Design a protein around this ligand. Structure first.
Ligand SMILES: O=C(O)c1cccc(NC(=O)c2c(Oc3ccccc3)cc(C(F)(F)F)[nH]c2=O)c1
Lengths: 10, 133, 401
């Protein structure tokens, strides 16, 4: 969550 | 339309206007000087037929051209000259590239043998040219 | 007619020196050296023809490495001084290339370190650079432009209300995407905000633009395709939907748009029509980063691997193992892949070797470079250097010349 640049499939 | 090309010998060739005009030189003689037929004092019939054949096929050196260029060096030289005189950039380029391919990857002695060139360096001069490589 | 003919002597004899010069201009260096020693007239043609000057110029025209060196080393000033100067210069350029290639293989470099001095929320999510400047997007909501030579900050651009996650610029504008879900357009010279695109429902995670069009992608799981008639006239052309999670990256050219997602997929779209073409499947977790050019896609994943793909058939050509954490950024040129990971490490990969299925895997990673103290978010490189940025709030310039 600290990395706002990428996101999982959640 | 058809345009008559006139070789240095005098033999006349009937050629389609759009292929003939691949030579900017011959195109200029038609479009700007309005000449018919087109005299070609610097290209004989034998070389002219060879160039016309090349221009039709070509209405970056492919396989068909390589077979077309399996000729002696004297004819290739005449072909370079015709392509220059007619200013057919495509033909001048493939013929010049063909000569470069006959030069590349050879020692000076093997190059001499390819083109029948005598070595005219002094011993001293050759060593100097060699020292600088 | 004649069996043999000395083209290089015969052509100048008839006043056609340029044809003889053009023939020799096709020679590689070693064959040009050979031509010099064929006979006195051949030497004269190469020398009076300035063939060594023409050879260096063709390289600068045909090789960004030679172009870059001409500029950096200063001998480019002489291009476009006798023939012998260029003949003696040519081996020095070769040796220079050799030392650069050795420095890459062995990791010998100098290092510049920019401390971004972020007051609150530390970290640099994105960056692009040229010879004049580094433009960087920061978790503190700003874009900072740094002077490439003095490393000082020349401009802070404010206006986003969340982190600056992605950016690209050209000769006229900077375009940025943000956690605040907007895309913004800035004047690259003055920094003035020129336009804001309100469209995405969630963070704008990546964008690319070129030749009047832009693609943007978002945590909202969609891709937007834009037509930019001007900085102030940007129209939505199409929305591509189909990803089942955030789309983390998008790249494109005239053939295809390429998107990759937390949903473990890469998707390929037709640029002209915006129709779905194919999914490149295979990574076992989400894809964090990607670069696409020609037929090659290279992607980096939470599964700690890098995959190389052919765009036309969708085949995976090579799996690159070695990173110990999530592969977070990736770039590639003609000779190398450069990747950054969540553990702060950067790896250099031999791209030619990687695309040759005979090469063993252990020979593929040339080096591991360890100078960041946090996640590596973005990098960009060329023949001479890497510029990288990190959660640790630094920008590094790695210089192999
Ligand atoms: O169900 C399973 O087998 C399973 C089990 C454990 C972990 C996961 N997956 C991930 O941890 C993950 C990412 O972690 C994050 C890192 C930072 C912020 C948010 C998530 C990021 C990506 C991305 F590359 F797409 F961004 N993908 C992923 O897959 C999947």
């Amino acid at each position: 969550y600290l990395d706002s640049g990428i996101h999982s499939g959640a | 339309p058809s345009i008559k090309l006139q070789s240095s010998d005098g033999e006349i060739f009937e050629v389609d206007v759009e292929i003939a005009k691949q030579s900017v030189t011959i195109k200029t003689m038609l479009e700007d000087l309005g000449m018919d037929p087109v005299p070609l004092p610097n290209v004989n019939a034998a070389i002219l037929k060879k160039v016309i054949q090349w221009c039709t096929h070509h209405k970056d050196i492919p396989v068909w051209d390589q077979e077309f260029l399996k000729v002696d060096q004297g004819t290739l030289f005449e072909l370079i000259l015709a392509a220059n005189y007619l200013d057919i950039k495509g033909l001048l380029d493939v013929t010049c590239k063909t000569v470069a391919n006959m030069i590349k990857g050879k020692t000076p002695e093997e190059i001499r043998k390819t083109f029948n060139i005598k070595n005219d360096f002094t011993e001293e001069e050759e060593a100097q040219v060699r020292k600088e490589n | 007619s004649m069996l043999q003919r000395d083209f290089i002597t015969a052509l100048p004899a008839r006043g056609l020196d340029h044809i003889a010069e053009n023939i020799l201009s096709y020679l590689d260096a070693k064959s040009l050296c050979a031509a010099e020693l064929v006979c006195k007239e051949w030497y004269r043609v190469t020398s009076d023809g300035m063939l060594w000057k023409k050879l260096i110029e063709r390289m600068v025209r045909t090789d960004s490495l030679w172009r870059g060196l001409a500029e950096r080393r200063g001998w480019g000033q002489y291009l476009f001084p006798p023939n012998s100067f260029y003949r003696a210069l040519y081996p020095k350029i070769i040796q220079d290339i050799e030392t650069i290639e050795s420095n890459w293989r062995c990791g010998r470099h100098s290092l510049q370190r920019i401390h971004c001095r972020s007051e609150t929320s530390k970290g640099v999510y994105c960056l692009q650079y040229d010879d004049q400047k580094i433009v960087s997007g920061l978790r503190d909501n700003t874009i900072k432009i740094w002077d490439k030579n003095t490393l000082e900050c020349k401009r802070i651009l404010t206006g986003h209300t969340g982190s600056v996650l992605c950016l690209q610029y050209d000769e006229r504008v900077i375009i940025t995407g943000s956690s605040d879900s907007t895309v913004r357009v800035w004047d690259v010279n003055t920094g003035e905000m020129l336009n804001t695109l309100i469209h995405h429902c969630e963070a704008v995670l990546h964008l690319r633009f070129n030749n009047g069009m832009m693609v943007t992608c978002s945590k909202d799981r969609s891709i937007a395709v834009w037509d930019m008639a001007s900085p102030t006239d940007i129209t939505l052309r199409r929305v591509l939907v189909g990803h089942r999670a955030a789309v983390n990256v998008v790249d494109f050219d005239d053939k295809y748009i390429v998107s990759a997602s937390g949903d473990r997929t890469i998707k390929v779209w037709n640029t002209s029509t915006c129709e779905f073409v194919r999914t490149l499947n295979g990574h076992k977790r989400g894809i964090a980063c990607l670069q696409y050019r020609d037929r090659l896609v290279v992607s980096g994943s939470s599964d700690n691997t890098i995959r190389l793909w052919d765009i036309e058939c969708g085949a995976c050509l090579r799996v690159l193992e070695g990173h110990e954490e999530l592969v977070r950024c990736i770039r590639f040129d003609n000779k190398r892949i450069v990747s950054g990971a969540y553990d702060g490490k950067i790896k250099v990969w031999d791209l030619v070797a990687a695309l040759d299925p005979r090469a063993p895997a252990g020979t593929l990673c040339l080096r591991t470079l360890v100078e960041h103290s946090g996640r590596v978010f973005r990098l960009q490189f060329d023949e001479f250097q890497i510029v990288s940025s990190s959660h640790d709030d630094t920008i590094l310039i790695w210089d192999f010349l």
